[PDB]
Amino acid sequence: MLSFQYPDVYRDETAIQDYHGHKVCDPYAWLEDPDSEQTKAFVEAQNKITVPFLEQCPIRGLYKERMTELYDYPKYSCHFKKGKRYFYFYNTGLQNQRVLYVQDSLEGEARVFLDPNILSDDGTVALRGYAFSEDGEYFAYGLSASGSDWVTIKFMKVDGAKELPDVLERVKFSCMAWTHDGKGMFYNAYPQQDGKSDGTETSTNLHQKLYYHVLGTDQSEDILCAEFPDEPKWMGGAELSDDGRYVLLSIREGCDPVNRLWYCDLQQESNGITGILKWVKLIDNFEGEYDYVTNEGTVFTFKTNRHSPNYRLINIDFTDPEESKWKVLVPEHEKDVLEWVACVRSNFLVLCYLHDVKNTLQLHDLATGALLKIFPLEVGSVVGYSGQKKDTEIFYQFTSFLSPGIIYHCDLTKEELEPRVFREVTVKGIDASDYQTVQIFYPSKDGTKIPMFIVHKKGIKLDGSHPAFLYGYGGFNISITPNYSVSRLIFVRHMGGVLAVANIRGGGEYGETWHKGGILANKQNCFDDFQCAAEYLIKEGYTSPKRLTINGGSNGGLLVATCANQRPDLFGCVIAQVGVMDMLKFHKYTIGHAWTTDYGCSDSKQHFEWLIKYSPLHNVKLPEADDIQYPSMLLLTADHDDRVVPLHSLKFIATLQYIVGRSRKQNNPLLIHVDTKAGHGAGKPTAKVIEEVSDMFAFIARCLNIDWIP
Ligand SMILES: *C(=O)[C@@H]1CCCN1C(=O)[C@@H]1CCCN1C(=O)OCc1ccccc1
């Protein structure tokens, strides 16, 4: 297996930092600098041993070809109306980036509106955010290069798809909202910083400001409408009310589902948007989330979690703002999470609920909050929707582990609502009938029942002989719901695998209580939940530790890496994608400061104590038992991942290779693959996606010696 030698990596034994009396050495701290010749050489040497290992087993070629075939199917988004025209995204099958089409009529012939594919040879320039003007005659869109979060906003005139000269730079984590007068658009921008701003830098992002750009002018003329010099981490996103009268400002600090809500009655501005707006601080604290749904005059309907962990809808009247006066339009459910709400056809509300990690869709009346219609859906997730206040119809996209996805449409003007299939594509190759998805609830260490989805071929023997791929995230109120993955189904069909997704704490599956159940002092709950999920699959005979693979990305990357350190005996293979590995320094880079709401910060003595116990980078240790070694490990990252700076994986792999790799008993490989012209994941071209999943399953195939099944 290991027919190579790990690269010689220098250890700076003098790099020792004090954390409230706790001294920690950081010998690979030099890897934090992406531009040095030393780090560049480290990356080059790592990939030099990783690549040949991945490409050696012919299985990679078989998987790649099979993925190219199965992934080649029509992928559409929901149709959405803007002005007098309809729009929808569409990928014929293997295009690197999906294309935006336009058609003047629902029955009319569509034409390409914007094709990101012609902007680069390798499809590494992608659309990241967009917003049409209220009348739908002007379009603003963001473009990111090589997977970076940095955006450049460009403009177009819809009629004739004419390119405009307006160009906005230094845009990141930005809103995009046109004022209804059609004069300009609000957006967020960061101050000028030394060094690079292309996604390879590690520089922290602070002092984000809200600007307003007048169409037809240079960015230098942009009006500063809001800023927080005393609070560097505050981020203010703007949006216009459905009636265009109010600018709603949602200020966030961190990643908790909470925000301050300030508003500006545009009718009350002296003479238009000329500077800092006359903000009325309706909700001036970070105690709850207030998500704007719609308003009728001064009565604003918001989805909130204020003393409602599963979320509810409340009406706040600007003329009588006190909390005791707020009306509860749609009360919180005792268990089901209200994920999102949209207002359509003037007085209808589309409510989407998460019931035991499965979605439901319902139409409610705006005035009373009363349920009017239940849109029939199978076991899966709603991952697409269209229907604004002025629209008279809705489109919604449904998907599941076994179904590619069905797009439904419903004309809301009709007396009797008849929802119908608008678009449905099937993947000829993966016969859904041959598989089944079962949901179970297993007890974690403390007794808490945790949901887990298992996908496998029908009629398999539970004798523990099957390879398994267990996925998890566990954090930031993110719910891991059913989704169609061609890559995972190939593992099932062509590698005889068992798929599993553990809905561990930290996620939003059971509201804010579920979220708080996997954060700060209780982050260990996440790891414990996932480890118990692994034990469940083993105990119940779905797989065995030597046949088990665990995967996670970003916060899930931390999940799988930590689980490798804590229970190396439970897994055969671990694939950690773009993970947070250095829990003591994560807050120092790019947007890392925002994650402290989930992890805490090492600056605090109390937080450091939680963090030091699980930080992957600080817990690599040779297993005590002679018959126990670390499982095979593959860390995937990229040089433009400015969300989770690559240094996390660089320092981690260097530590794994030195501490564990050098031991005799370590026969399983510990590798890293750093991709070029790629970032955290969003906007990654189809070509790179296929290369990535091929590397993953080939690594698994080679390490567990799995035969490909034709
Ligand atoms: C992947 O899990 C990484 C590392 C841990 C958190 N995280 C993120 O990408 C988080 C959670 C999803 C969104 N996110 C994030 O940092 O978004 C940037 C941001 C935007 C607006 C306010 C604060 C942060």
Please give the Cα distance from 29 to 376 (Å, whole number): 54
Question: What's the number of CA atoms in the CB half-sphere (13 Å) around residue 373?
Answer: 15
SS3 state of residue 594: helix
Two tokens, residue 30: 């030099």
What is the distance of C-alpha 170 from the center of its chain? 22
Cα-Cα end-to-end distance for the chain: 25
What are the DSSP E strand ranges found in 133-197? 138-145, 151-157, 162-171, 176-178, 184-189
Distances (CA, A) of 129 to 66, 198, 217, 344, 542: 32, 17, 21, 22, 41
Do 13 and 123 sit in the same domain of this protein?
Answer: no
Residue that is written with structure tokens 């238009």 in the block:
272
Please state the three-class secondary structure of 85-151 as a single string: EEEEEEECCCCCCCEEEEECCCCCCCEEEECHHHHCCCCCEEEEEEEECCCCCEEEEEEEECCCCCE
DSSP class per residue in 428-448:
TT--GGGEEEEEEEEE-TTS-
Question: What's the number of CA atoms in the CB half-sphere (13 Å) around residue 113?
Answer: 26
Asked if 518 contacts 509 with a C-beta cutoff of 8 angstroms, the reply is: no
Q: Residue 356 carries which side chain, given as an amino acid letter? A: D
SS3 state of residue 332: coil
What are the DSSP E strand ranges found in 243-376? 246-252, 260-265, 280-283, 290-296, 299-304, 312-317, 327-330, 337-344, 348-355, 358-365, 371-375
> Catalytic residue positions?
554, 641, 680
Please give the Cα distance from 326 to 330 (Å, whole number): 12
Do 59 and 162 sit in the same domain of this protein?
Answer: no
Asked if 20 contacts 11 with a C-beta cutoff of 8 angstroms, the reply is: no
Q: Could you tell me which residues come within 8 angstroms of residue 44 by beta carbon, excluding any fewer than 6 positions away?
A: none
Of 426, 447, 472, the position where a domain reaches its end is 426
Nearest to 466, CA basis, from 541, 370, 552: 541
| Pocket flag, ligand 1, residue 644 (CB < 6 Å) | yes
Do 691 and 632 sit in the same domain of this protein?
Answer: yes
Do 337 and 362 sit in the same domain of this protein?
Answer: yes
Q: What are phi and psi of 527, to 5 degrees?
A: -60, -45
Q: Could you tell me which residues come within 8 angstroms of residue 704 by beta carbon, excluding any fewer than 6 positions away?
A: 467, 546, 547, 549, 572, 573
Strand partners, 455: 437, 499
CA angle 618, 634, 608 (to 5 degrees): 20
Do 163 and 305 sit in the same domain of this protein?
Answer: yes
Q: What are phi and psi of 688, to 5 degrees?
A: -65, -35
Please give the Cα distance from 264 to 259 (Å, whole number): 16
How many angstroms is it from 535 CA to the middle of ligand 1?
Answer: 30
Give, for ligand 1, the residue of 188, 504, 554 to mutate: max count of ligand atoms closer than 8 Å to Cβ: 554
* 14 CB burial (10 A radius; 0-12, 13-18, 19+): exposed
Nearest to 382, CA basis, from 362, 365, 366, 410: 362
DSSP label of 456: E
Q: What are phi and psi of 44, to 5 degrees?
A: -60, -45
Nearest to 702, CA basis, from 195, 74, 84, 58: 58
**CATH number for position 312:** 2.130.10.120
Asked if 247 contacts 238 with a C-beta cutoff of 8 angstroms, the reply is: yes
How many angstroms is it from 293 CA to the middle of ligand 1?
Answer: 23
Of 363, 396, 426, the position where a domain reaches its end is 426
SS3 state of residue 304: strand
b/e sequence 293-311, b meaning 16+ C-beta within 10 Å: bbbeeebbbbbbbbebbbb
Do 320 and 215 sit in the same domain of this protein?
Answer: yes
Do 20 and 106 sit in the same domain of this protein?
Answer: no
Strand partners, 188: 210
How many angstroms is it from 312 CA to the middle of ligand 1?
Answer: 24
DSSP label of 8: P
Q: What are phi and psi of 188, to 5 degrees?
A: -110, 140
Q: Could you tell me which residues come within 8 angstroms of residue 363 by beta carbon, excluding any fewer than 6 positions away?
A: 348, 349, 350, 351, 371, 372, 373, 375, 417
Do 435 and 422 sit in the same domain of this protein?
Answer: no
Residue that is written with structure tokens 């309706």 in the block:
282
Q: Residue 284 carries which side chain, given as an amino acid letter? A: D
Please give the Cα distance from 543 to 534 (Å, whole number): 9
Q: Is the dihedral of CA 457, 460, 465, 469 positive or negative?
A: positive
| Pocket flag, ligand 1, residue 476 (CB < 6 Å) | yes
Strand partners, 187: 176, 211
CB atoms closer than 10 angstroms to residue 8:
7
What is the distance of C-alpha 142 from the center of its chain? 18
SS3 state of residue 262: strand
Please give the Cα distance from 364 to 361 (Å, whole number): 10
Which method was used? X-ray
Q: Residue 313 carries which side chain, given as an amino acid letter? A: L
How many angstroms is it from 591 CA to the middle of ligand 1?
Answer: 7
SS3 state of residue 220: helix
Do 434 and 377 sit in the same domain of this protein?
Answer: no
Do 272 and 396 sit in the same domain of this protein?
Answer: yes
Rg value, the chain, Cα: 26
Please give the Cα distance from 445 to 460 (Å, whole number): 28
Resolution of this structure in Å = 2.0
Asked if 608 contacts 521 with a C-beta cutoff of 8 angstroms, the reply is: no
Do 707 and 688 sit in the same domain of this protein?
Answer: yes
**CATH number for position 686:** 3.40.50.1820
- The helices-and-strands tally (H runs, E runs) of the chain is 10, 39
Q: Is the dihedral of CA 157, 161, 165, 167 positive or negative?
A: positive
How many domains, the chain? 2
* 539 CB burial (10 A radius; 0-12, 13-18, 19+): exposed
Atom of ligand 1 nearest to the CA of 235: 22
Give, for ligand 1, the residue of 591, 641, 644 to mutate: max count of ligand atoms closer than 8 Å to Cβ: 591
| Pocket flag, ligand 1, residue 252 (CB < 6 Å) | yes
Q: Residue 219 carries which side chain, given as an amino acid letter? A: Q
| Pocket flag, ligand 1, residue 235 (CB < 6 Å) | yes
Asked if 366 contacts 348 with a C-beta cutoff of 8 angstroms, the reply is: yes
Do 453 and 576 sit in the same domain of this protein?
Answer: yes
Q: What are phi and psi of 75, to 5 degrees?
A: -120, 105
Domain that holds residue 215: 74-426
Of 372, 399, 426, the position where a domain reaches its end is 426
| Pocket flag, ligand 1, residue 31 (CB < 6 Å) | no
Q: Residue 178 carries which side chain, given as an amino acid letter? A: W
